Design a protein around this ligand. Sequence first.
Ligand SMILES: [Ca+2]
Lengths: 224, 54
Amino acid sequence: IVGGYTCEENSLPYQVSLNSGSHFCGGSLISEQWVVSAAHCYKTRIQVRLGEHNIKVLEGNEQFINAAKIIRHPKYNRDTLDNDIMLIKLSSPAVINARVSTISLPTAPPAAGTECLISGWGNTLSFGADYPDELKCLDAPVLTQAECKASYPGKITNSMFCVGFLEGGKDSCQRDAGGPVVCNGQLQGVVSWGHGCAWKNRPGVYTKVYNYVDWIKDTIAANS
Amino acid sequence: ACANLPIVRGPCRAFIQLWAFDAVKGKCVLFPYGGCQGNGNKFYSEKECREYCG
Ligand SMILES: [Ca+2]
């Protein structure tokens, strides 16, 4: 996350870190045994870490839980990035508590202008690299489809929307992929891609979670 | 075989660490792949990269 602030410890209890040895993507807890992330965060083996704040320090309250199933969207397209969403099933259920809890799936796409909250452990520079120890957060509006297409002519599919600031300076970034965009109590987006991070006219592009609501339901039902 | 490929991170925002040929330095190195739209200059191991490149 570039241009944001360190979250208050454990105030985003839905945020998870995916780890294969080190942290490499974000995700969102949506039920006790299921996490949403990005398809391109796929790896064969993944550990989900919940209740994290500082990913480098054992604080005693994290839950470390291996993924038992890792299911990319069956229509995820490697060429265009269409349908960049993935579900992970935990090998045993998360214990819900003040520090670890679920974020609700959305009931409508989000409107342009809506202020959202984006988070994770990605890079904090637009130029160079500085990867933070503690979870970062950023407040950012949803942009119109028009501004989003104009920013990335020809590349914005139906599964995608933009969130950020056209003047640049604030955006998600590498190692944030998979993490949540929450608007008014609901999970509206997944961190996907952009040209650079926080460059002017290059807002972050995010997968529209609302479009996958039935797929998520079905996939949970089919793997219980 | 690998002398004419750059190392491409791509636009995605994961950190999938991989191997690629660095043409200037002449060897296989670790690089941070963003997870999408790479080129053919990326491999899961040093071994796989050295074999494909020579
Ligand atoms: Ca920790």
